[PDB]
Amino acid sequence: SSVTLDIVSASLDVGEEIVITATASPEGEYSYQWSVDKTGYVSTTSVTGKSIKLVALRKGEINVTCTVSQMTQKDYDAFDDYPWYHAVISNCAVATTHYETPQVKEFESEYFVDLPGWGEQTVVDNDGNPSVKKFNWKCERVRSFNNRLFALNMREANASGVTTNYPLRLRWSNFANENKAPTLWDDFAYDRVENGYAGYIDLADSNGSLIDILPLKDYLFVYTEFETYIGSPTNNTYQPLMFKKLFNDSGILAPECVVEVEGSHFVVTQNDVILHNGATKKSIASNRVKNMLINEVCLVNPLATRVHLHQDKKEVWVLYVGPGEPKESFACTKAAVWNYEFDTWSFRTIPYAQCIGLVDPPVLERGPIWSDFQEITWDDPSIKELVWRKDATNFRQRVTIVGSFLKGFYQVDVGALDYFYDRLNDVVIEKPLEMR
Amino acid sequence: MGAGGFRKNTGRNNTTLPYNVGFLNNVQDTETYNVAVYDELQKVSTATNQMFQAIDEIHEEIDVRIKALNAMNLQFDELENRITTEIETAIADIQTQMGNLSTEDIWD
Amino acid sequence: MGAGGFRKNTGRNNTTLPYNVGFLNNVQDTETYNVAVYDELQKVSTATNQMFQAIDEIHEEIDVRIKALNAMNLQFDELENRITTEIETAIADIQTQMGNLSTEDIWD
Amino acid sequence: MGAGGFRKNTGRNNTTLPYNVGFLNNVQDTETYNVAVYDELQKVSTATNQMFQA
Amino acid sequence: VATVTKKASASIKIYPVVSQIVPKESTISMNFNQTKNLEVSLLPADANNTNLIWEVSNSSYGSITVDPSDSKLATLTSFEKEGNLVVTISTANESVVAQIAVNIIDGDSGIFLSQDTVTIRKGGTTTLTAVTGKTPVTWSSNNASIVSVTPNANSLTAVITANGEGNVTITADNGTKTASCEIVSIPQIDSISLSQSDVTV
Known part of the structure; x- marks a missing residue:
């Protein structure tokens, strides 16, 4: 109900302090956000606490306000055919999926929130009166570049709710600041009368859907299943990024089939596998595995295909759904692996991966201390798989982990076992790892 | 119509870094030489795109100064009009009126 | 506060020489080829530095033309104010004063 | 006497085209490397002459 | 969701x-004579907001050395001893502290001088500063072949050169009143050390 403040008005001298506090109507537990109607003027502490400290810094008049909220849980709908995509910026982690707004976790916060200033546009009247409006925007994918954030394949609504898919749209944000994600997305800033005010290009290529984005050495590469564009950042001018074409036939297979190995791009490019330096490309499979991949990938579900950069052993591996699997499964049964230190291909099993990544391990594995097992017994409380010293791939002693269809997590390069599955019994099976 | 202050915001923050060729002549290996010439052309590409951004920023500032110029000259001519009209009118009209009125009222 | 003459010396004396690539394809020796690309990148470096110098000279000439444009428009408006006060005062005060002060000491 | 006219026509018709280096690192043959550097320097010459005209 | x-x-x-x-x-x-009671004036920049406190170095130079302020301004008073002192105008608690320098000039046309006594190593140099009721201030030294004295353009300031070693005295102000300053010229080395006394070769 009704909200109150400790105060309604105040006089400060510059450099003086003050504290105001808000209380809800009912004695319940709520979430707070403090706000100020002009930027500068004051210093603040933890704008999510019910009682805020202020410090006058500049001559003027201002409004300080508090929003109080009855927050509740509401589930996402990020289905297995539409996963999360998870970019990174300034130590804030982005979520991003279809049907949802992209959302970000701040460095100075313990929960997610919708990307700040996402969906904003600005109007100006004749004779110059501005106003800001938030329209519904939904994305496909979000990534980082040149201290900005980027967005693809927009569903970009407007006043009167006919949302239009712009499959060739690509939007970009401001620059960052201290421990914070970007703050505005309106191409129509500077009409309200920081650096890097936003933009959009709306490209010219083939069917769109506009599958992925990835940088390289200051140079964006944007991919459309056939054909690709370079983006070059200018400094700051009439055109903050200039986009030039690169390929008339190359273009990525599926949403995360590109990775930066060594000053170059590894791509599953619809027909084949390529390694391009920018300007020029090669075929890493021409006549050695081509007719073997296209096959094994074609059979079940190609859009489940992924790549991951196993730096630790100088391998790049392309993950796919095995030859005999349900046509609506996305669990990658198998991976084809390229050792870029010698240009040599192999294949392997992986434990039904939904997703893969590098990570830090648990503590019991993280180079521990006899002084930690004060609750453990030699008698293996179902914990057995601990070798005094596990060979190392990395000096920070880090680990590649798979998020699995099998209700859990797995490490994917570790002492020899394999975890097969059994639909006839709906049970997991462990068996010795077989090389052939 | 104030000559709108310098848009201090067009090119003066692009450090136009003078492109200087790194020593290619000590690179006896073709692969290192080929990298060094590519790195040299990369500095050229960087510099070319900086000089363009400055040329467009220069054209926008010129376009602002031509809009500012219509104003100052046209206003010069408006104030010329003011001068002529007001001054001539006042001086002549009054001298005449005053002299005539007082002089006549008195000598008959 | 006159406009400044042309700095007849911002860049119009810098012969910005049109960069033209010399023949690289006949240089069969890698060492001479490496010299010829270094010499072409040196002509690029020269022309890029001449264009950055001409863009800085243009930015300086625009910085001069914007210093020339703003405060002289302020002189226009302040001289315009002198005009206003002086001659408005004249017209009104003048006519009123003479006629009234003449009714002067002479009517009764 | 008149601030006469925008010369509406001083350089905004020259699309200065942003110079970008093509991949040189894969050219293992000196003769093909030599051509690729010459073609890159030709784009530089072009952009240099457009900037001088502007 | 909210x-x-x-x-x-x-x-x-x-x-x-x-x-x-x-x-x-x-x-x-503000220079003033022994028991004049002069008013003293100051303003904050921008004329905006805060008040000030008036304070003084050595509060023994007047009967109650500085009177408390009215508003921004204040007023001064003095008692029978001589030299410079400084009145600081400190804002109410915060760190802005302007300063006014005042000379209590010993009499109506008297003099005082900065240092009493000086110590200089031979070949070195230092300066002496008078304060006077009239601008002509002549300087003179006994033993000019051991300590030279040379007036600056304002006459009230002079430069001293230690041409030789020994105890010397300076007088200043021909202007109806003559002051004093003692000066000791000191050796460029006072002692020395060696590495050994009980050697054997």
Whole structure:
């Protein structure tokens, strides 16, 4: 109900302090956000606490306000055919999926929130009166570049709710600041009368859907299943990024089939596998595995295909759904692996991966201390798989982990076992790892 | 119509870094030489795109100064009009009126 | 506060020489080829530095033309104010004063 | 006497085209490397002459 | 997701805190005779907001050396001892502290001088500064072949050169009143050390 403040008005001298506090109507537990109607003027502490400290810094008049909220849980709908995509910026982690707004976790916060200033546009009247409006925007994918954030394949609504898919749209944000994600997305800033005010290009290529984005050495590469564009950042001018074409036939297979190995791009490019330096490309499979991949990938579900950069052993591996699997499964049964230190291909099993990544391990594995097992017994409380010293791939002693269809997590390069599955019994099976 | 202050915001923050060729002549290996010439052309590409951004920023500032110029000259001519009209009118009209009125009222 | 003459010396004396690539394809020796690309990148470096110098000279000439444009428009408006006060005062005060002060000491 | 006219026509018709280096690192043959550097320097010459005209 | 939100709002007025940017004076420096009671004047920059406190170095130079302020201005008073002192105008608690220098000139046409006594190593140099009721201030030294004295253009300041070693005295002000300053010239080395006394070769 009704909200109150400790105060309604105040006089400060510059450099003086003050504290105001808000209380809800009912004695319940709520979430707070403090706000100020002009930027500068004051210093603040933890704008999510019910009682805020202020410090006058500049001559003027201002409004300080508090929003109080009855927050509740509401589930996402990020289905297995539409996963999360998870970019990174300034130590804030982005979520991003279809049907949802992209959302970000701040460095100075313990929960997610919708990307700040996402969906904003600005109007100006004749004779110059501005106003800001938030329209519904939904994305496909979000990534980082040149201290900005980027967005693809927009569903970009407007006043009167006919949302239009712009499959060739690509939007970009401001620059960052201290421990914070970007703050505005309106191409129509500077009409309200920081650096890097936003933009959009709306490209010219083939069917769109506009599958992925990835940088390289200051140079964006944007991919459309056939054909690709370079983006070059200018400094700051009439055109903050200039986009030039690169390929008339190359273009990525599926949403995360590109990775930066060594000053170059590894791509599953619809027909084949390529390694391009920018300007020029090669075929890493021409006549050695081509007719073997296209096959094994074609059979079940190609859009489940992924790549991951196993730096630790100088391998790049392309993950796919095995030859005999349900046509609506996305669990990658198998991976084809390229050792870029010698240009040599192999294949392997992986434990039904939904997703893969590098990570830090648990503590019991993280180079521990006899002084930690004060609750453990030699008698293996179902914990057995601990070798005094596990060979190392990395000096920070880090680990590649798979998020699995099998209700859990797995490490994917570790002492020899394999975890097969059994639909006839709906049970997991462990068996010795077989090389052939 | 104030000559709108310098848009201090067009090119003066692009450090136009003078492109200087790194020593290619000590690179006896073709692969290192080929990298060094590519790195040299990369500095050229960087510099070319900086000089363009400055040329467009220069054209926008010129376009602002031509809009500012219509104003100052046209206003010069408006104030010329003011001068002529007001001054001539006042001086002549009054001298005449005053002299005539007082002089006549008195000598008959 | 006159406009400044042309700095007849911002860049119009810098012969910005049109960069033209010399023949690289006949240089069969890698060492001479490496010299010829270094010499072409040196002509690029020269022309890029001449264009950055001409863009800085243009930015300086625009910085001069914007210093020339703003405060002289302020002189226009302040001289315009002198005009206003002086001659408005004249017209009104003048006519009123003479006629009234003449009714002067002479009517009764 | 008149601030006469925008010369509406001083350089905004020259699309200065942003110079970008093509991949040189894969050219293992000196003769093909030599051509690729010459073609890159030709784009530089072009952009240099457009900037001088502007 | 926020099911219900309610807002609350408050204005704040932020006054400029001037006199955190310096105050400035009509009465920057004031020379006066032994028991004159002169008024003294100062303003904050921008004329905005805060008040000031008036304070003085050695509060023994007047019967109650500085009177408390009215508002921005204040007033001064003096008692029978001589030399410079300084009146500092400190803002109410914060760190802005302007300063007014005043000379209590010993009499109506008297003099005082900066140092009493000086110590100089031979070949070195130092300066002496008078304060006087009249601008001509002649300087003279006994033993000019051991300590030279050379007036500056203002005459009230002079430069001393230690041409030789020994105890010397300076007088200044022919202007109806002559002051004093003692000067010791000292050796360029006072002692020495060696590495050994009980050697054997």
